[PDB]
């Protein structure tokens, strides 16, 4: 180690440290302000990709922010990488304190914005409070809330009108009224996210009315995507579908509207949390409240507070079905981010206990959602859900491991899933193994098509479904040529 130091090779130094799995050797003396920018960031990345050892990765990240901060120039891209995994309040907090003295407010604003997007949502709510106590100047703190971030993007999307209207026109002109009209409304809405398209709404009012059942609820809900984060004309036009203004129409339309209201506010939801929370408590019934609770959860997403969860917990105990599915989903959305002991215990038993099918679906996905980056606790949950009488619970268990593990691969999680699927000809498990891969293998994004090439051959339509879903998630941001070709035969196969 002394001998590499003499040569001054930053690269050799880190490599010997990397193999030894020792902190002392790693701790810098070849980057104590010896060419400050660039070099730290490669090393963090390497510790993630190369290792599957949680202990080495966490120690190296923590110490590194604190020494780097001290150097002539801190560089933030590296500090964000340490922070998202650990979730430490300190890392961001120390970096901003130096920045206050030099009076370089902009430098700080830049970090806050990035943090919103990348880091775990619950961690983001806590820091806002924390900065006031630490004593950093409000302007940075505003950006860190993220209320500013969404709006700055919104400003661009709305004004430029980035999504073309033309694409939506072909879909509306071409397609008939059947199941097909319901479909169209969701299609245009999803493409034209973050910019207003009232033109579609008013014109094809008729189509919304024609639909019956849950499908009618779904059409009205799509309005909520189009009008995402706005509060100008967007709100006005949406108001009328909700009971808020004229023509609320049928019951399904009222609920798709309250849901669309929540979806627009989503995870900036604070003002909306009081309004929604109250409606759901008093009535604890109806289509209209089912859409509200759905909306309440999305708005609340991440701060992991006990209050909202507890009020929702009762609605499950009361066991009214319609609302039940929305409250079930919602537990998972608020706690999202990091482990919370009460959510894991009440949802496992309650989901297992009920034979109310939609309560069973809501509650089932919700157990997976609460985990993220807490690997080991999930190993327990998944086996128990798989053994049960309910088919749904088997698929939810996969989700549980996928999330807890997403952070770094391991051998453990893939191995667990894999044995169940081969052993038996059971469909529900067989899809589960293959599905689960994409989330965990995320670190080297090539790998998911490697495992899935053998699995896509399977004649079970289940496996074939599960192979496609997995490829989708892993490759999403950084693509692969191999992933594209695997999807083609699934499209071809005639099963639905």
């Amino acid at each position: 180690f002394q001998r590499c130091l003499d040569d001054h090779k930053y690269k050799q130094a880190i490599g010997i440290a990397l193999e030894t799995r020792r902190l002392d050797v790693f701790e810098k003396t070849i980057l104590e302000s010896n060419d400050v920018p660039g070099m730290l960031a490669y090393s963090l990345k390497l510790c993630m990709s190369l290792m599957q050892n949680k202990q080495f990765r966490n120690k190296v990240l923590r110490v590194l922010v604190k020494i780097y901060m001290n150097l002539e120039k801190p560089d933030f891209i590296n500090v964000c990488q340490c922070l998202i995994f650990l979730d430490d309040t300190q890392a961001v907090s120390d970096i901003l304190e130096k920045l206050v003295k030099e009076d370089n407010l902009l430098m700080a604003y830049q970090i806050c914005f990035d943090l919103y997007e990348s880091a775990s949502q619950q961690f983001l709510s806590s820091v806002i409070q924390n900065l006031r106590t630490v004593g950093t100047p409000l302007k940075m703190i505003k950006i860190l809330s993220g209320e500013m971030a969404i709006e700055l993007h919104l400003q661009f999307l709305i004004r430029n009108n980035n999504t073309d209207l033309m694409i939506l026109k072909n879909t509306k002109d071409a397609v008939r009224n059947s199941v097909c009209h319901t479909a169209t409304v969701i299609a245009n809405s999803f493409m034209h996210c973050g910019t207003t398209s009232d033109q579609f709404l008013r014109d094809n009012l008729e189509w919304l009315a024609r639909a019956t059942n849950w499908a009618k609820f779904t059409a009205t809900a799509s309005l909520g995507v189009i009008h995402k984060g706005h509060e100008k004309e967007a709100l006005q036009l949406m108001a009328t579908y909700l009971p808020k203004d004229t023509s609320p129409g049928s019951a399904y339309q009222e609920g798709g509207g309250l849901y669309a209201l929540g979806l627009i506010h989503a995870n900036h939801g604070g003002d909306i949390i009081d309004y929604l929370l109250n409606q759901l408590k008093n009535a604890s019934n109806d289509i209209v409240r089912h859409g509200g609770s759905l909306g309440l959860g999305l708005a609340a997403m991440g701060t992991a507070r006990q209050d909202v969860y507890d009020l929702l917990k009762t609605n499950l105990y009361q066991d009214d079905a319609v609302t039940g599915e929305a409250a079930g989903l919602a537990l998972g959305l608020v706690m999202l981010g990091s482990k919370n002991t009460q959510a894991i215990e009440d949802m496992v038993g309650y989901a297992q206990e009920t034979q109310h099918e939609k309560i069973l679906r809501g509650l089932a996905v919700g157990i997976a959602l609460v985990m993220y980056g807490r690997m080991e606790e999930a190993d327990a949950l998944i086996e128990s859900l798989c053994r049960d009488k309910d088919p749904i619970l088997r698929r939810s268990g996969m989700y549980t491991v996928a999330m807890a593990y997403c952070g770094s691969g391991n051998n453990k999680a893939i191995r667990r899933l894999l044995h169940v699927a081969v052993s038996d000809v059971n469909d529900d498990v067989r899809r589960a193994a293959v599905e689960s891969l994409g989330f965990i293998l995320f670190r080297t994004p090539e790998q998911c098509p490697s495992v899935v090439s053998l699995l896509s051959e399977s004649y079970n339509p289940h496996v074939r479904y599960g192979a496609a879903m997995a490829l989708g998630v892993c490759c999403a941001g950084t693509g692969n040529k191999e992933a594209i070709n695997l999807l083609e035969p699934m499209t071809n196969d005639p099963v639905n």
Partner: protein, 289 residues
């Protein structure tokens, strides 16, 4: 045409499904029916716990086939068991036809629909079946117009759906008019699964058992004698078989009725048979004394 309906997902229990197979095989070819007992849970799920039959008649799958006498009689007794169950619907079998309902059968489905609109007719096929996955379909049964308009997929939501063809275009058309295949899920678990697994505890005696030595000799003789006959073709087989085209090979080197397949098959029975008999005789000797 507009109406606000939901589809019924039929959750069939393991106990219930097996009884439906039992009844349907028995009825052959004459079509037979019965009522389904269950519970209505959630906002669409009708679950079939158990099934009983209404009488076997050549007037089967009819309103007539339905017996008021059976229904009352069972229900008083069921009160005592500590399960008086709801009539979730009715099952029938067609072993003269597929999943296409008969003309009487559509009226009969309707009468059940009046009593409880969460009523379905499940078609059970055991010799008009093309699949060993258990050819069963579910219908609520709604009018023709609903298909034509395209209303019928708006009502079904909360369905996946599926389409199979036991018997041609005529069946497909009948299916589309009805309500097509609405999803069947199964309520099953490992305890029920273990019951079905079984064969014989008698395996206990049998693993140890071996036969008279004269018999061991009969087997060995019969196989060696057999092997002589095929051997003469085998010579040709190894000398030639440049052909890889199955039809030409068959005529040329007696490729069909192949000496390789059969001679291998023969060495393998003889070896395994001798091993288990021999192995058991020796094991028993040491242990009993």
């Amino acid at each position: 045409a507009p109406a606000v309906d939901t589809a019924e997902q039929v959750y069939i229990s393991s106990l219930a499904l097996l009884k439906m197979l039992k009844h349907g095989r028995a009825g052959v070819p004459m079509e037979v029916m019965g009522l389904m007992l269950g519970e209505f849970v959630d906002d669409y799920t009708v679950r079939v716990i158990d099934v009983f039959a209404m009488p076997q008649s050549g007037t089967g799958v009819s309103v007539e086939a339905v017996d008021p006498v059976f229904q009352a009689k069972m229900l008083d007794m069921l009160k005592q068991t500590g399960r008086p169950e709801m009539v979730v619907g009715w099952y029938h079998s067609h072993p003269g036809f597929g999943c296409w309902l008969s003309g009487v059968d559509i009226n009969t489905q309707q009468s059940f629909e009046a009593l409880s609109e969460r009523a379905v007719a499940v078609v059970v096929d055991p010799i008009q079946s093309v699949k060993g996955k258990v050819v069963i379909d579910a219908f609520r049964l709604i009018n023709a117009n609903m298909m034509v308009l395209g209303h019928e997929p708006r009502q079904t939501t909360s369905n996946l759906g599926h389409l199979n063809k036991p018997s041609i275009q005529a069946l497909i058309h009948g299916l589309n008019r009805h309500y097509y295949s609405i999803t069947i899920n199964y309520r099953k678990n490992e305890l029920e699964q273990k019951m079905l697994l079984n064969l014989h505890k008698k395996s206990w005696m049998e693993g140890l058992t071996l036969q008279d030595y004269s018999e061991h000799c009969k087997h060995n003789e019969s196989v060696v004698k057999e092997m002589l006959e095929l051997a003469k073709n085998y010579n040709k087989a190894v000398e030639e078989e440049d052909k890889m085209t199955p039809e030409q090979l068959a005529i040329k080197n007696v490729g069909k009725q192949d000496p390789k397949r059969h001679l291998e098959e023969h060495v393998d029975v003889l070896m395994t048979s001798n091993i288990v008999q021999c192995l058991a005789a020796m094991l028993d000797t040491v242990v009993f004394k």
